[PDB]
């Protein structure tokens, strides 16, 4: 018959907990981006709706390799003309890891709709274990 496993509409979701307190920073994104798609996954034919479910912790412990601790363009221009452009170096932004840096995965995903389905939907935080505002249940 037509081979292609269907799209059970994001059938299963395996929960996980990275550490981010590591030393890989930017390298980690890939195995973080591959995961929310169909990396470790075999069946659940990607391309179509899908994903997984992992979560970041502190993450505040990153340095990148070279002097990237001091670079990284970063600007979040707005629909305001009048000459805006908000450039802030990485360390300048690392003061409060928000929608960025830890969120380096967004630029690594299919982008637009559906990819957008995974997006921040992995949670980030910046303190590891304490009062996990996130779902405490099953994780690895």
């Amino acid at each position: 018959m037509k081979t292609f496993t269907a799209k059970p509409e994001t059938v299963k979701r395996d929960w996980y907990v990275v550490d981010a307190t590591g030393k890989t920073l930017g390298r980690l994104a890939t195995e973080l981006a591959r995961r929310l798609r169909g990396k470790h996954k075999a069946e659940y034919t990607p391309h179509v709706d899908t994903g997984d479910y992992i979560i970041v912790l502190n993450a505040d412990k990153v340095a990148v390799t070279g002097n990237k601790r001091t670079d990284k363009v970063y600007y979040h221009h707005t629909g305001h003309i009048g000459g805006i452009k908000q450039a802030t170096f990485e360390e300048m932004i690392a003061r409060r890891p928000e929608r960025v840096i830890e969120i380096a995965v967004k630029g690594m995903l299919p982008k637009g709709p559906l990819g957008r389905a995974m997006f921040r939907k992995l949670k980030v935080y910046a303190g590891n274990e304490h009062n996990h505002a996130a779902q405490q249940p099953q994780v690895l």
Partner: protein
């Protein structure tokens, strides 16, 4: 002494016009489609089926490189272990073992890991 083109006239247009998909607008309704589009279909088709043999291979290795490495030795080293054998050489394609017979596959990564001199 009668061309009376009408006679095959119809059959020809109807033939190509027979593009079920309809595609879009003039691409079915108007004869204009045929050698413009029905022809493209033939062209785009001509290359994709044969160019596809690799597009899947690129996927096959894309997953082997993603499966075998997680348990030591990258895809680069993998086939190299595997490479050494008298009969041990079963190609990829079935290489998707990582999806159904993980135990086999990881039991196959040793066939290479421990194999690499």
């Amino acid at each position: 002494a009668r061309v009376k083109r009408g006679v095959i006239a119809r059959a020809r247009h109807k033939k190509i016009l027979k593009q079920a998909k309809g595609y879009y607008g003039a691409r079915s309704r108007v004869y204009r489609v045929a050698f413009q589009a029905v022809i493209k279909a033939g062209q785009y088709a001509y290359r994709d089926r044969r160019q596809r043999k690799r597009q899947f291979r690129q996927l096959w290795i894309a997953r082997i490189n993603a499966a075998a490495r997680q348990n030591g030795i990258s895809y680069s080293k993998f086939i190299n272990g595997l490479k050494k054998a008298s009969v041990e050489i079963d190609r990829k394609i079935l290489a998707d073992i990582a999806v159904f017979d993980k135990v086999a596959f990881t039991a196959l990564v040793e066939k290479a890991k421990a194999a690499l001199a």
